[PDB]
Design a protein around this ligand. Structure first.
Ligand SMILES: [Mg+2]
Ligand SMILES: [Mg+2]
Lengths: 405, 393
C-alpha cells in the first residue's frame, strides 16, 4: 500500500529559468508525491548535482542525466520498497550511489526521490507533510529572516540585510509587519533619491534606511523588529571593505561596535569560510547576545558542524537540503545542531514552486526560516500561513523563544 | 460524492506581496480543490497592508457563498456559476467580489476534476483537449516601471513541441542578456525604436535560431497609454502605416493594443494588416462579451486577450473563449501582476487555444510553463504543439 509502484522524473525549469529535476513517486495506494529540487553545481566538497554539459541545450545546464538516473537506476532499485520507511529508503539511495558526495546518481536525483517518497507516504496516511515528518509535537511557526536590502556582489557602490518580526503574536501578523516595512522601505529609498532592493550606497547607510523604514511603518526596533545580517565575508576575504577603504581580530571589533548601535540579533558569515581561528573569537565576544550563523563556513556538513560544535566556533547553522542530498541526513544535521545551536532552514537562489522547506521548518520546530523579500519564489510564506491555520489552537509562533540568547 | 461539503477561504500573498484570496472547496468524496485569485473586494483598512487586505472577500466566501453552495453538485460547473452570479446579483460582481466568485468557481472545478480522477484540462475540455500553446515569451520591456512600447515578446512557432519551444525561448532570453551587456519580466535598458527589434534579431541568430521560420516577434506597444505621441519626436492613419513598415522589415506575427482604447475607426482600418498580422484587443476589448461581439461585426481585430480575473467566473471565461474562436478570432489567455496558481495552463489546453501570454522564462511565470510541460508529457502521443497552426494569419 505505501509500497512504491512507480518512480518518474522530468526536466522542468527553476525560478532562474534553468533546468531542474522534478520527481514523482507513486505508491500501491494510488498516492503520488512530487518534488522539485533546487538546482545548483560542478565544484566544492559537498553533495554534487548532475548537470549534462550538452552545450546545444540550455548552455550545458540540462538535467537529462539526473532524470535518467531516476527513471532507470533508482526506479529499478526502489520499486517495491516501503516509502513509509524514510531512513531505510535514504540509506538505499546512498548505497545505490556508492560515492561520498552523491556524484554517480546526482544529489538532485537522490533528494528528489527522498522528498517525493516522504510526500507520497504523507498523502497515503492522509497527513500534512510537517505532521508526517515530525510527528505529534510539530507545531512551531518560524520567525522569518526577510530580505529587504541587497549589497556587495549585487551592489554598484555587505551582501544581505534582513528584518525579523520577533514581536509578532503569530506568523500571519509577522508576515504582514515585514511586508508593510518592505513597502515603506521603497518609499524611504525613493524620498532620498537612490529579492530585496539593491541601490548605490557607507556600510551604515543601509542600517539607517532600515531603522527609518521600521519606524515610519509604525514598528518598534528591538521589541517588535530585529535585524539579521549576512555580509558574506568569504566574498571580501587575502587576510579583509572597498566601501570604507580599509583592510580577523579587527573585523570582530567592527561587529561588536555595530551590534551596540543597531538591533542586530543574528550575523551570518561575519568572518570567512575557513577562518576557524576568528569564528571562535567572534563567539567569545558576541555569542551570548548575538546568533552567529555558519553558511559557507559550515556548508551544511555534519563533520564541519561537529568540529564547530566542539571548537565553540558558532551557535547557529544554515540548513540547505540540496547541499546534503537526502531528507534523513538533513533531519540528522538539524537534530545534531539543535541538541544547543539553532538550525536555520534556508531556501536556494535556484528555488521553485516546491514548498517542502515550509513543512520541514515546522516538522523540526526549527524556529527560524531564511526566505527572500515578501514579493512567488512567497509560496513558502503561503505554506506557513496554511500550516498555522491547519494547526489552529496548537500553533505557536517561535517569537523571541526562536533565539538561544 | 461530488456534492459540496465545505467552502473555506483565507488571505494569502500574491507574487507582488499583496493580499489575495485562496479558496478551498471540499466535496463529499473528500476531494479538495484549491484556487488563488489575485486582485487588480478590497478592504480599505489602512491599519492592515495599507488598505490592500481581502478579509471582506474571505468573509463573503466563508459565510455567504459557503451557506448558499453547501450541498450543490460541484460537477455542474454552469449551474454552480449561475448560482454564484445570482447570489451576488450585480452586473460586475460588486456585492461578493469578482475574486470571491472566481475563487469558488475555479476551486469547485478542481475539486470535481480530482473526484473523477481527471487532470483539469481533460475535466474542462473533454476528450479533444490536447493542443499545447505557442508561448508569447516576454524578453524585453519599456513604457513604464514595475522606448515608447511596453512589451517585446518572442514566439517559438517553429518548434516541434512545447518542451522544445520553451528551451528555444529560454536560450534566446539568456542570449539577449549577453547582447545587452555588449552595448518585471524582460530586460528594460534605456535606448531608437528599431534598436529593441535589432537586439532581439541579434539574440535570435546568436542563439542559433532562424527568424520567421522558427522564431517570430509579438508586440505589446500599449499605444492606449500614450493617447499618438511617440515622444522618436513624432505626433491614427500614420500609426497604421508605421506598423506596416515594421512588419515588412521584421518578423512581427502579432500586435496588441496597436491603437488606443476607443480608436474603433483606426482599429477597423488596421483591413490594412489584419490580413497578415494578429491584432490583439487587450484594453480595446477588456474581455467583455458585449464589447467583443461589437468588434466581431465591425471587424476591428482578429484576436482577444483573455483575463480570467476580469471575467469573474469559469463558465463566462469559456463562453468568451468560444465566441471569439467560433467567429474566426484567436483567444490568447493571459496572466496578471499578482500567484502560484496554474489554472490558465490547464484552461489553455482545455480550449485548444493555441497561444498563451504568461511572461519571461524566470516562479509565478515558470510554474505555468512547468504545468504545460507536465500536460504535454501526460498527453503523450495525443499531444500537439500548435506551431504555425496557432495563427489565423
Ligand atoms: Mg549566506
Ligand atoms: Mg497589454
Amino acid at each position: 500500500s505505501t509500497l512504491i509502484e512507480a518512480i518518474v522524473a522530468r526536466e522542468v525549469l527553476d525560478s532562474r529559468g534553468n533546468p531542474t529535476i522534478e520527481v514523482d513517486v507513486r505508491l500501491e495506494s494510488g498516492d503520488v508525491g512530487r518534488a522539485i529540487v533546487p538546482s545548483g553545481s560542478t565544484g566544492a566538497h559537498e553533495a554534487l548535482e548532475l548537470r549534462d554539459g550538452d552545450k546545444s541545450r540550455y548552455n550545458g545546464k540540462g538535467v537529462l542525466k539526473a532524470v535518467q538516473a531516476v527513471n532507470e537506476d533508482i526506479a529499478e532499485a526502489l520499486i517495491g520498497f516501503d516509502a513509509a520507511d524514510q531512513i531505510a529508503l535514504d540509506q538505499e539511495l546512498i548505497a545505490l550511489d556508492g560515492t561520498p558526495n552523491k556524484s554517480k546518481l546526482g544529489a538532485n536525483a537522490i533528494l528528489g526521490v527522498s522528498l517525493a517518497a516522504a510526500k507520497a507516504a504523507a498523502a497515503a496516511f492522509g497527513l500534512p507533510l510537517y505532521r508526517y515528518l515530525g510527528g505529534v509535537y510539530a507545531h512551531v511557526l518560524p520567525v522569518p529572516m526577510m530580505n529587504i536590502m541587497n549589497g556587495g556582489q549585487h551592489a554598484t557602490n555587505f551582501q544581505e540585510f534582513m528584518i525579523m518580526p520577533v514581536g509578532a503574536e503569530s506568523f500571519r501578523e509577522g508576515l504582514r509587519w515585514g511586508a508593510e516595512i518592505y513597502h515603506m522601505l521603497k518609499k524611504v529609498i525613493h524620498d532620498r533619491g537612490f529579492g530585496g532592493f539593491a541601490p548605490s550606497l557607507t556600510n551604515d547607510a543601509p542600517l539607517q534606511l532600515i531603522m527609518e523604514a521600521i519606524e515610519k511603518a509604525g514598528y518598534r526596533p528591538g521589541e517588535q523588529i530585529v535585524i539579521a545580517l549576512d555580509p558574506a565575508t568569504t566574498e571580501i576575504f587575502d587576510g579583509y571593505l572597498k566601501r570604507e577603504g580599509r583592510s580577523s581580530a579587527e573585523m570582530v571589533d567592527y561587529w561588536v561596535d555595530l551590534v551596540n548601535r543597531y538591533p542586530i540579533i543574528s550575523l551570518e558569515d561575519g568572518l570567512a569560510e575557513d577562518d576557524w581561528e576568528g569564528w571562535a573569537l567572534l563567539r567569545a565576544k558576541l555569542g551570548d547576545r548575538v546568533q552567529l550563523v555558519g553558511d559557507d563556513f559550515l556548508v551544511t556538513n555534519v563533520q564541519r558542524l561537529q568540529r564547530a560544535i566542539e571548537a565553540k566556533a558558532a551557535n547557529s547553522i544554515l540548513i540547505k537540503l540540496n547541499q546534503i542530498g537526502s531528507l534523513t541526513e538533513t533531519l540528522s544535521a538539524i537534530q545534531l545542531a539543535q541538541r544547543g545551536w539553532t538550525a536555520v532552514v534556508s531556501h536556494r537562489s535556484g528555488e521553485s514552486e516546491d514548498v517542502t522547506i515550509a513543512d520541514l521548518v515546522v516538522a523540526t520546530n526549527a524556529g527560524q526560516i531564511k526566505t527572500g523579500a515578501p514579493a512567488t519564489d512567497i509560496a513558502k510564506y503561503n505554506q506557513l500561513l496554511r500550516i498555522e491555520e491547519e494547526l489552529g489552537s496548537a500553533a505557536r509562533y517561535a517569537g523571541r523563544s526562536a533565539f538561544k540568547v
